[PDB]
Design a protein around this nucleic acid. Structure first.
Ligand SMILES: Nc1nc(-n2cc(C(=O)O)c(=O)c3cc(F)c(N4CC(O)C4)c(Cl)c32)c(F)cc1F
Ligand SMILES: Nc1nc(-n2cc(C(=O)O)c(=O)c3cc(F)c(N4CC(O)C4)c(Cl)c32)c(F)cc1F
Ligand SMILES: [Cl-]
Ligand SMILES: [Cl-]
Ligand SMILES: [Mg+2]
Ligand SMILES: [Mg+2]
Ligand SMILES: [Mg+2]
Ligand SMILES: [Mg+2]
Ligand SMILES: [Mg+2]
Ligand SMILES: [Mg+2]
Lengths: 720, 720
DNA sequence: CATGAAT
DNA sequence: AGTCATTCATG
DNA sequence: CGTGCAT
DNA sequence: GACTATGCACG
C-alpha cells in the first residue's frame, strides 16, 4: 500500500493520501520520489466518531496511517516524531471524494489534533476541466477549476477546441497530475485550520456522531435541495479554511447528492438513478423483451460510458437485482444464467450472463419518445437522459425500494399490481379518498416471497404516516411420517431473508437444544420450489417448537415500513395518499405532454395532406412551374406566390421523389384528412377537459392491470 | 468449494466437476441434492504428467478432489472406499472446455486408474443450441447437439421462431442445465474406458509430457489446419469412448484453436485475434484518434458482445498492452490514465481509463470498408468480422509478437518502421533479394526500450531461419563522484524486463555481498526519464561489478528469436524473406481488391450520370410516363422497356426530387463524366499491370514511412 | 522465473 | 479494486 | 447484523 | 472470477 520517499526529511516531506489504488498508481508515477510518499485508500475510510475503539484500532487503513506518520496517536501524539511536514488529502473532485475528505479530517481532528492545529493537513485541488486546441505545436493545454475559469478559457490560445471534463484522478496521468495538483510550484492546496475549538467540535459531532436526528435536522436547515451551489471562485497557491466550514461544505455536498441522486427512489416512477439509467440505456439500445438477449458486459459498459460514471460492479449488481423475482414483485430485467438464489449465492459474473428489459419495464418507458418527461445532460454533456420515466404503472409501490442515504433511509415493500391500480383508479375518481376506503383496494404489501403478514392496524399506520411495524411469518405445514413422527415444513419465507442462513440458524437451535424436540433440519428445496423440513423427534410438541422458532429465529420477522422518496427534489416521508396523488399528477403531465406532441405532429401532416390534395388538381401546372424555376428555393417561392402554398407545403412538394407521381389518389388523401381531423379533436378534448384526460388515465391503467395482473402471494391477518 | 450431497450412498452418488464457479452455482441450483455433489474447478487444472509431485500434492484443487472422493491416490487407491459411483466432468462446449477434460483425465488415468478402468468416469455433454419461442406460455423448446440435428430441428409446423447458440454453461438457467445434462433419465453422457493400456499410455504421454517435439510432431500428422471436422452424429443416454480417442480429439481441437485462434499472430497484419477484434470494434464504433476518448469499459464490452466471447479482463489486458510504448514500438491504442509502468505496477481498472486507436492503427484498418479483405461470421452468426486487416504498414515486424500456444511458441521482436518499409520496398523491386542485401536496410530489431543488441551473425541466422540468440545489454555510462568514487548509471534496459524487479535484484547483490564494491542502488527514474544509479564504494573494481551485474542480473539478457506466425491457417517458422513476401502478396490483394471496389463505384456513378444527361432530352415523356405507372417498380419497368435505361439508371431517375428538374446544367455533369473516366482508367491500369500495381504499393509504403518514421532506439554491435 | 492470451 | 492458481513453449 | 448503491 | 474493507439509517 505505502510507497515511501527515498529520503527522510520531516521539514519538507509530504504524505499523499490518495482516493483509491488506481489513482495512487498515477500519483506514484507523477511524484517527486525524493520527498513525496503515497498511501492509497481502499475506498471509504472508517468513521472514527461513530465506530467504537476495538474497531478503530483493528482498522488496517487507520493503523498504516499511524505507522507511517510515525508520531503515535491521540493521547500520546508527538508532533516532532512526524515524518512529514504536510499531509495531503487528494481525492477525486466528486461527492464521494468530499465524503472521504470528511472522514479523514474527522480522524485527524480527534486523534491527531496537534497536527491539524499546526496547519500540517492540506487538501489537493485537482482540475475539473482541461482544454486542448488539438495540436497547435504539441497540444496547447491549459486547466480550469470553476465554471468561470472555463469561460475565461474559451477565449485564449484558440477556438474550435477539445474540452475534457474530469470525473476522477484515475483519468489523469502522471505528467498531468504533477503539473496540476502535485508539483508545489504550480499546485493549489487548501490548508485546514481550527478557528473555534468549540464550534468545530459541534460541526464534527452532528455530521459524524451516531445521533441521526441532529444530522437530519442540520440537513433540513442547511442543505438547499431546491437550489444550486455558488461556484466558490478558485484562489492561487495555498489558502486557509476552517475545519468548521470545510466539514459542512463537503458533507452537505455529499448528503444532498446521496439523498437526491443515489439511494432514494423518485416518488413518481419508484426508481433510483442507477435503475432509471439501466432501463433507459438498455431501451435506447433496443435491448427489449421482444428481441434477443445481449451480453451483460455490453449493457453495463454502455451504461457506464453514456450515463452512470461509477463502478461496473455497482451497475451490474443493481441490474441483477432487477431480474431477481424474490426481490422484485414485477421484474424489470430478464437475465439468462445464474442471477443468484435465495441462498444468496453469487450471480454469474457479467461476462457469463445476458439480459434484456422485461415486457412490463417497456411500460415504464412507454411514450418517452414523445417529450413526456424532462431530460437533462449526462455527466459529460454529450447526451440527454430522462430525470424520470413515463411510468405507465406505479412502480414505487409495486416494486418498492430499500435504500440508505444520509440523514434518511427508506423501506417501501412490494405490492400487488392490480391492487395498486385499483386504489389509484378509485383515487382518480375520488381525490379526497381516505385510507380506510383505499385499503378496500390496497389491503397491504404483497411480497414476491409470499408468507403471512400480520398487523392490519400497523399497515394502516404505515399507509397513513409512512411508518409502522408489521409481522411477516413463514408459511408452514405439518406432515406425518414413519413412527407416527411429525415434521414442520416451510414453503414461504419472509422478504429479504437468506434461506441458507435461516436453515443454519434453525439447525443451531437444534444443536444448542434451545428447545426440546428437533431431530434434523433438511433444506429440500430445488429448482422447482422452496421446502425446508424440520424433522422432529418421537412425540415432541410440534407447537412448542414452531413457536420457539418464530420467536427466536427469522422464521418470523418484523417488517418496518419507512416510506421515504424524493418529491420535488426533497426527501419526504409519505403514506399511500401522497404516493398515489404524486403518481396521478405524474401521469397527468405525461398524458397531456404526449397529447400535445401527437397533436402537433397530426397538424403538420394535415397541412401537407391539404397541400398534396390541391397539387393533384394542378399537377401539370405545378410541374411546369418547378421546371420553369432556377433552383429549389426559387421553386418554393414560385409555388407560394403563384398558388399560395405555405412554406411547409412548398418544401414537401418540392422534395417529392418523381415516383410519387404514381399515386395521385385524392380520395385516399381525403380519408387521411378526415382521420387526422378526428384524431386532433380527440387529442384537443384531452388537453381541453381534465375529466376527458383522467378517463384516459384510468382506461390505460386498466389495460395495464388486465395485461400484467397476477394473484396475491402474501396472505394477510389482522391481529399481530 | 465443495457442495456435498445430503445423503451418503456410494451406490449412485455423483460428483460433478464443473468448469467455473459461475457454472458451479448454476449446477448447485439445478441438481438433485440427495445424490449429486458439486465441485467447481477454478479454471485450468494442473497437468499431472508435467508438474513435479511436490507441486502436485500441494495443489489446492487436487487435494480437495482426493479428500472428496475419499479413496487415496494411485497405489494407496481403494476403489471400494469411493464416495461416488459416477464422477462426471462437466465443462463448457468450447475448446478450453475440451482442454480441462484433457487435464483431469490425465490426473485420473495417472493417480486413480481403477476408477477409469471400471467405467466410473463420465463426460458432461451439454447442448450447443436451443430452439423456439411461444413467449410467456411457450410450449416451444428443443435442444440440439450437432449441425445435423439443428437442420432436422428447424422443421416444425409453426414458423421461424428464435434460435440460441450456447457458448458455455454460464448461459444456461438451472432448469435447462437439469433437463439436458444433469437429470440421469434425460441427460447424455460419455463413459470413459481404457480399450488398450499400451495405446492409452503412449497417447497421454505424447499430449501431456515435457517433450514438446513429439507433441508438435503428433499435431503435424494428426491436426488438419486447412480442413474442418464433420460432427460426431449424436447418440443416447450413455456412450463409450476409449481414453485414447477422447484425449486425441479433445487435445487436437484445443491445440488447433490456440495455434490458429489465440496465441500466434497472422503473418500479414501481425495481429492475434483479440488484438484484431479490439482494433476493428473500436474502429467500427468510431473510437479513432481524431475523435474523443471513450470509456474503456464501453469499448471492452462491445468487443466482448460482438466479436470476442472471452473475459473482459483478457480483453482489457490486451488493449492496455497495445497502449504501452515500452511493449509496442508503435502503439495501436492511446489510453488516458494509469496504463501501467515499466515497473509493471498494475494499470487502472477499465472503469477509470478511457481509450481510442492511435493514428497509425488507422493505417492497419485503411480501406476495410472497400471489400479488401476476407470477413467471417462472428461467434453467434449475427455479424461479420475481418479475418485479417489491410495493414498499410508491416505490423508483424514493427510491433513484433510474443505468444505461447500448443506445440509452438513465438518471439518476434519489434523493428524500426522506416527500416522494415525500406526492406519491403527493395524487395518489391527485387523479389529474389537475399538476406545480406535486405540487412543493409534492416540490420536488426529496434526495441521501444532501446538498449544495445549484440550478435550480427545470430541476427542473420534469425533472419534466415526464424531462430537466433542475441544479447541485449542495458545502456550504461560511468559518472565520477566526490571522494574517489564512481557510480554506474543505467538509462535503457532490455525489452520485457521489469525495472523495479531489476533494481531489487541488483540491490540483493549488494546485500548478500556476492560481489564487492556496491554502496547503494537507487532508482532515480521520474515521469521524464529512466535513470538507475549504482553508487560504488571508494576504490571498487567498476569493470568487475558491471560484468557481474551483466552476467548474473537482467542488466543484460539473451533474446531468442522464435519467429512463428500463421501462414495459410498453419503455423510456420519464418525468416525475414517469407515475412516480407507474405506482406507484399497481402498488400497486392488489398490494393487490387480496393481498386476493383473503387472502380465498380465509379462506373455506377458514371452510368447514372450518363442516364441523367440522356433524361434531359426526354423530360416531358419521362414525366408523363411516370404518372401513368402503377407504382415505383412499374415506372422503372417502363423506363427500361420504353427508353433503354438500365436498372441503376432507372432507379436514379425515379428517385430524383422534383426540385432537381430546375437544373439543366449538362456541363457540370460532363466534367464529372470525364473525371470518372480518367479515374476508371487509372484504376483499371492497376488491375491490368502488375508493375503499375507494385509501383502504387511502393508509393504508399513510402508515404507511411515519411509520415510515421522515427529514429532507431537500440544500437547494434557485431561482436557478442 | 517470466513472458501473454486463456480458464 | 487488488490478490491469488493454473496451461502452454522456451531457455 | 444485514440490507443496497457507492468507494 | 471469488474474497475482503468501508459509509449511510434502522430494527
Ligand atoms: N474463479 C475463477 N477464476 C478464474 N480466474 C480468472 C481470471 C480472469 O478472468 O482474468 C484471473 O485473473 C484469475 C486469477 C487468479 F489468480 C485465479 N486463481 C486464484 C485461485 O483461486 C485461482 C483465477 Cl481462478 C482467475 C477462472 F479462470 C475461473 C474461475 F472459476
Ligand atoms: N481497492 C479498492 N477497492 C474498492 N472496492 C470496490 C469494490 C467494487 O467496485 O465493487 C468492491 O467490491 C470492494 C470490496 C472489498 F471487499 C473491498 N475491500 C477489502 C479491503 O481491501 C477493502 C474494496 Cl476496497 C472494494 C474501492 F471502492 C476502492 C479501492 F481502491
Ligand atoms: Cl408525403
Ligand atoms: Cl445526382
Ligand atoms: Mg470515483
Ligand atoms: Mg461489489
Ligand atoms: Mg423472530
Ligand atoms: Mg468458457
Ligand atoms: Mg487476469
Ligand atoms: Mg544476465
Amino acid at each position: 500500500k505505502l510507497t515511501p520517499a527515498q529520503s527522510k526529511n520531516p521539514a519538507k516531506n509530504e504524505l499523499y493520501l490518495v482516493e483509491g489504488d488506481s489513482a495512487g498508481g498515477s500519483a506514484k508515477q507523477g511524484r517527486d520520489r525524493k520527498f513525496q510518499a503515497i498511501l492509497p485508500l481502499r475506498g471509504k475510510v472508517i468513521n472514527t466518531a461513530k465506530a467504537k475503539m476495538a474497531d478503530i484500532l483493528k482498522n488496517e487503513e487507520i493503523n498504516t496511517m499511524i505507522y507511517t506518520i510515525g508520531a503515535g496517536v491521540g493521547a500520546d501524539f508527538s508532533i516532532e516524531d512526524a515524518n512529514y511536514d504536510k499531509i495531503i488529502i487528494m481525492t477525486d473532485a466528486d461527492t464521494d471524494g468530499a465524503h472521504i475528505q470528511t472522514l479523514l479530517l474527522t480522524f485527524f481532528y480527534r486523534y491527531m489534533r496537534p497536527l491539524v492545529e499546526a496547519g500540517h493537513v492540506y487538501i489537493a485541488l485537482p482540475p475539473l476541466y482541461k482544454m486542448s486546441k488539438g495540436k497547435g505545436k504539441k497540444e496547447e493545454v491549459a486547466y480550469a477549476w470553476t465554471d468561470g475559469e472555463l469561460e475565461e478559457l474559451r477565449k485564449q490560445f484558440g477556438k474550435g477546441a477539445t474540452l475534457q471534463r474530469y470525473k476522477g484522478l484515475g483519468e489523469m496521468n502522471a505528467d498531468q497530475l504533477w503539473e496540476t495538483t502535485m508539483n508545489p510550484e504550480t499546485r493549489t492546496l487548501i490548508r485546514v485550520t481550527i478557528e473555534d475549538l468549540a464550534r468545530a467540535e459541534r460541526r464534527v459531532n452532528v455530521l459524524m456522531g451516531d445521533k441521526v436526528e441532529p444530522r437530519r435536522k442540520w440537513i433540513e436547515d442547511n442543505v438547499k435541495f431546491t437550489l444550486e451551489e455558488a461556484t466558490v471562485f478558485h484562489m492561487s497557491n495555498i489558502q486557509n479554511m476552517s475545519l468548521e466550514d470545510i466539514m459542512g461544505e463537503r458533507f452537505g455536498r455529499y448528503s444532498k447528492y446521496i439523498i437526491q441522486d443515489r439511494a432514494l427512489p423518485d416518488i413518481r416512477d419508484g426508481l433510483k438513478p442507477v435503475q432509471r439509467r439501466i432501463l433507459y440505456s438498455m431501451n435506447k439500445d433496443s435491448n427489449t423483451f421482444d428481441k434477443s438477449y445481449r451480453k451483460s458486459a455490453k449493457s453495463v459498459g454502455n451504461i457506464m460510458g453514456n450515463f452512470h460514471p461509477h463502478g461496473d460492479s455497482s451497475i451490474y449488481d443493481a441490474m441483477v437485482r432487477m431480474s431477481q423475482n424474490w426481490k422484485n414483485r414485477e421484474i424489470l430485467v430478464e437475465m439468462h444464467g445464474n442471477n443468484g438464489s435465495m441462498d444468496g449465492d453469487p450471480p454469474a459474473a457479467m461476462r457469463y450472463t445476458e439480459a434484456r428489459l422485461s415486457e412490463i419495464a417497456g411500460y415504464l418507458l412507454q411514450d418517452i419518445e414523445k417529450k413526456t418527461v424532462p431530460f437533462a445532460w449526462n455527466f459529460d454533456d454529450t447526451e440527454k437522459e430522462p430525470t424520470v420515466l413515463p411510468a405507465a404503472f406505479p412502480n414505487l409501490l409495486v416494486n418498492g425500494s430499500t435504500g440508505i442515504s444520509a440523514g434518511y433511509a427508506t423501506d417501501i415493500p412490494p405490492h400487488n399490481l392490480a391492487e395498486v391500480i385499483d386504489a389509484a383508479v378509485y383515487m382518480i375518481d375520488h381525490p379526497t379518498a381516505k385510507i380506510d376506503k383505499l385499503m378496500e383496494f390496497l389491503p397491504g404489501p404483497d411480497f414476491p416471497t409470499g408468507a403471512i403478514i400480520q398487523g392490519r392496524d400497523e399497515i394502516k399506520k404505515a399507509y397513513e404516516t409512512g411508518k409502522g411495524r408489521v409481522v411477516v411469518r413463514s408459511k408452514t405445514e405439518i406432515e406425518k411420517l414413519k413412527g407416527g413422527k411429525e415434521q414442520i415444513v416451510i414453503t414461504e419465507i419472509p422478504y429479504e431473508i437468506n434461506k441458507a442462513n435461516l436453515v443454519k440458524k434453525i439447525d443451531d437451535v437444534r444443536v444448542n437444544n434451545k428447545v426440546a424436540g428437533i431431530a434434523e433440519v433438511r433444506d429440500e428445496s430445488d429448482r422447482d420450489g422452496l421446502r425446508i423440513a424440520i424433522e422432529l423427534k418421537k412425540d415432541a410438541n410440534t407447537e412448542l417448537v414452531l413457536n420457539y422458532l418464530f420467536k427466536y429465529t427469522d422464521l418470523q420477522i418484523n417488517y418496518n415500513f419507512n416510506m421515504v422518496a424524493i418529491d420535488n427534489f426533497t426527501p419526504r416521508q409519505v403514506g399511500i395518499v401522497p404516493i398515489l396523488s404524486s403518481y396521478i399528477a405524474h401521469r397527468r403531465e405525461v398524458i397531456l405532454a404526449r397529447s400535445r406532441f401527437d397533436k402537433e405532429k397530426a397538424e403538420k401532416r394535415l397541412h401537407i395532406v391539404e397541400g398534396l390534395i390541391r397539387v393533384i388538381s394542378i399537377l401539370d401546372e405545378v410541374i411546369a412551374l418547378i421546371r420553369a424555376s432556377e433552383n429549389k428555393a426559387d421553386a418554393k417561392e414560385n409555388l407560394k406566390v403563384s398558388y399560395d402554398f405555405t412554406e411547409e407545403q412548398a418544401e414537401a412538394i418540392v422534395t417529392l421523389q418523381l415516383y410519387r407521381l404514381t399515386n395521385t389518389d385524392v380520395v385516399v388523401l381525403q380519408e387521411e384528412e378526415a382521420e387526422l381531423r378526428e384524431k386532433i379533436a380527440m387529442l384537443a378534448a384531452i388537453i381541453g377537459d381534465e375529466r376527458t384526460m383522467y378517463n384516459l388515465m384510468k382506461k390505460e391503467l386498466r389495460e395495464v392491470k388486465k395485461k400484467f395482473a397476477t394473484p396475491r402471494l402474501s396472505s394477510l391477518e389482522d391481529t399481530a
